[PDB]
Amino acid sequence: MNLCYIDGKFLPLEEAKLPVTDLIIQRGVGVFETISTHSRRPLMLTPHLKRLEGSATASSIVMPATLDEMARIIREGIKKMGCETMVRPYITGGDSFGKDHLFSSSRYFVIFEEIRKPDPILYEKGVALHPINAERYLPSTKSINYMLSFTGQRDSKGAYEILYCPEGEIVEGSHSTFFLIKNGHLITAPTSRALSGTTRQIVLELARRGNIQVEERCPLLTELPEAEEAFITGTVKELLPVVRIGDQIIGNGVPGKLTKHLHQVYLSSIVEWLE
Amino acid sequence: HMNLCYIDGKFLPLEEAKLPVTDLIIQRGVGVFETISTHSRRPLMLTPHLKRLEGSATASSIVMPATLDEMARIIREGIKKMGCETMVRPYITGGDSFGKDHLFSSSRYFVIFEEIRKPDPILYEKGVALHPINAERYLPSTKSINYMLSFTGQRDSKGAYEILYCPEGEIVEGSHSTFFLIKNGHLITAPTSRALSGTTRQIVLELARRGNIQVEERCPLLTELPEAEEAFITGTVKELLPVVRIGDQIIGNGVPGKLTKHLHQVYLSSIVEWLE
Ligand SMILES: Cc1ncc(COP(=O)(O)O)c(C/N=C(\CON)C(=O)O)c1O
Numbered sequence: 001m002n003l004c005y006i007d008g009k010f011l012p013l014e015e016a017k018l019p020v021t022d023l024i025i026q027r028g029v030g031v032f033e034t035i036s037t038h039s040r041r042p043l044m045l046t047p048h049l050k051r052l053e054g055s056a057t058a059s060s061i062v063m064p065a066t067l068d069e070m071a072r073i074i075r076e077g078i079k080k081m082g083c084e085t086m087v088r089p090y091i092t093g094g095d096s097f098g099k100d101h102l103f104s105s106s107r108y109f110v111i112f113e114e115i116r117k118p119d120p121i122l123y124e125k126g127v128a129l130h131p132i133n134a135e136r137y138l139p140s141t142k143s144i145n146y147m148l149s150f151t152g153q154r155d156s157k158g159a160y161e162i163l164y165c166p167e168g169e170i171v172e173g174s175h176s177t178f179f180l181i182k183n184g185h186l187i188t189a190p191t192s193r194a195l196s197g198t199t200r201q202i203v204l205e206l207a208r209r210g211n212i213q214v215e216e217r218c219p220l221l222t223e224l225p226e227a228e229e230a231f232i233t234g235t236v237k238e239l240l241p242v243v244r245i246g247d248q249i250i251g252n253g254v255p256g257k258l259t260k261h262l263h264q265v266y267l268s269s270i271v272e273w274l275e
Numbered sequence: 276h277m278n279l280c281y282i283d284g285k286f287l288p289l290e291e292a293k294l295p296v297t298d299l300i301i302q303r304g305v306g307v308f309e310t311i312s313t314h315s316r317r318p319l320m321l322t323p324h325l326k327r328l329e330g331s332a333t334a335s336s337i338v339m340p341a342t343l344d345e346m347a348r349i350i351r352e353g354i355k356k357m358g359c360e361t362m363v364r365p366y367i368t369g370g371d372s373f374g375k376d377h378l379f380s381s382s383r384y385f386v387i388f389e390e391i392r393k394p395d396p397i398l399y400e401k402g403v404a405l406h407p408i409n410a411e412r413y414l415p416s417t418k419s420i421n422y423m424l425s426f427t428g429q430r431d432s433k434g435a436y437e438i439l440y441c442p443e444g445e446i447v448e449g450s451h452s453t454f455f456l457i458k459n460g461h462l463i464t465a466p467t468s469r470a471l472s473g474t475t476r477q478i479v480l481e482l483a484r485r486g487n488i489q490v491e492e493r494c495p496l497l498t499e500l501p502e503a504e505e506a507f508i509t510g511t512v513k514e515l516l517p518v519v520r521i522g523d524q525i526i527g528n529g530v531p532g533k534l535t536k537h538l539h540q541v542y543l544s545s546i547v548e549w550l551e
């Protein structure tokens with residue numbers, strides 16, 4: 001059964017509640033991370049928790065607990081779940097922004113859910129993305145503000161996910177890092193424009209090991225017709241092939257050989273980063 | 276009076292009201308709201324505010340969890356319970372799931388009632404400074420709960436009262452306000468293609484029409500600010516607040532101007548026509 005750690009107790013997820021005074025509710029002041037398990041071990045736990053601290057600090061939120069304590073809560077909740085888990089620690093703004101311009105009464109909670117991997121068919125067929133002329137502001141901060149990721153699916157024609165394409169420059173997915181494959185090179189946006197993905201970080205290491213050239217630049221919507229493949233990355237989704245962006249088919253519209261090869265190396269290699 | 280929250284059919288002490296962490300308002304920032312203020316304990320622009328709330332929900336693919344008539348009912352009852360000048364914020368949440376039909380169909384709602392906090396009289400006397408940034412609100416006619424930039428951005432805002440969205444040097448609006456420039460005795464303000472359709476903004480344009488004051492609905496430019504005479508920002512609670520500095524640029528003589536003070540007096544003399 002799904003759990004939420006809040007106020008020192010693991011609760012059934014559906015019972016845990018947050019006071020409406022909290023500025024996460026009133027004004028969207030919050031940061032979080034998504035951490036997944038393989039063989040019940042958290043992947044990239046320390047990178048995730050360092051990114052959580054980075055997000056909080058960037059947002060003038062004083063940490064309401066140490067990373068060691070969050071690591072403690074996360075391992076214990078995984079053990080309590082007894083299954084592969086997706087774990088989201090949340091840090092809230094809390095009730096006030098002080099005269100010192102800090103949130104010094106932050107609340108925290110951690111959600112534990114049984115992991116929901118995309119359907120095997122999606123890895124076989126690949127997915128479609130809906131491009132929109134928008135961008136994440138302060139992109140290295142993972143805030144709770146995902147509202148664009150949903151509201152944009154009104155005219156998204158059943159797309160799996162939105163793709164942020166400000167001024168025709170591809171930056172990242174609403175929930176993912178985006179990679180294009182052109183003449184057997186990886187192209188992906190620099191961390192000035194996109195979240196510093198944990199999955200993104202592993203894929204660049206796998207590219208270094210495999211002698212695959214990476215260009216850290218925004219791929220362009222106008223380069224898509226010359227691309228062979230595309231995929232998106234995230235801790236739960238792993239590497240998910242992209243076969244269509246808007247009305248533009250990628251390559252011959254099925255997952256490509258380099259995507260499938262990187263996904264196999266990913267699954268073989270990730271033991272190195274289990275904690 | 277003590278502050279209240281209407282949630283799950285009951286008026287509660289504000290400090291006791293709690294929302295389930297399953298709600299995507301918490302998890303994913305999926306929410307919309309309005310701020311409604313009172314003058315003489317009557318709500319100002321209640322119907323426009325509630326129509327804008329519904330507009331925000333619908334634009335965000337959120338199915339309204341109550342009728343506007345029901346929300347109006349809850350708001351009037353809470354104001355009566357408060358007995359004092361009140362700021363009222365009805366919130367519509369995404370609720371627990373985004374369905375396969377791409378709608379939030381289990382929305383929650385709640386309404387916060389607080390004693391009004393007007394900006395300090397000194398601010399109206401001296402005016403305030405704004406911090407310009409090269410950013411924009413997306414889907415600008417939707418009033419979401421996402422004001423996180425408005426806070427986090429005050430690390431680099433040098434004590435500015437409020438951030439000013441100035442994408443590519445075009446002034447659109449404040450993080451919490453409509454922005455007005457005054458040049459040659461007429462008003463300049465960004466069109467509602469770019470800025471929230473402010474209720475205060477709407478009253479000020481009607482006051483301008485009544486007074487024969489020209490309004491240009493275009494984005495004022497950072498580069499025009501040296502030639503400007505005055506500037507002010509508008510909002511439900513702040514009314515008209517003079518702006519004497521944007522970034523390092525002084526506006527006019529650096530004190531509140533004659534036309535700003537005139538519109539504020541006509542605003543307060545006229546306000547009763549839009550009470551409900
Ligand atoms: C805006 C954004 N860009 C990239 C990633 C990928 O970062 P990574 O997970 O560190 O590789 C995510 C999270 N992906 C998620 C979680 O979404 N909150 C996934 O679980 O697939 C994201 O929200």
Ligand SMILES: Cc1ncc(COP(=O)(O)O)c(C/N=C2\CONC2=O)c1O
Pocket residue numbers: 310448449450451452453471472473474475476509510511512513514
């Ligand atoms: C982004 C933004 N634009 C414009 C406005 C003004 O809209 P109005 O209040 O005229 O409908 C506000 C709210 N500003 C507020 C909230 O209520 N009191 C204020 O000063 C706002 O947050």
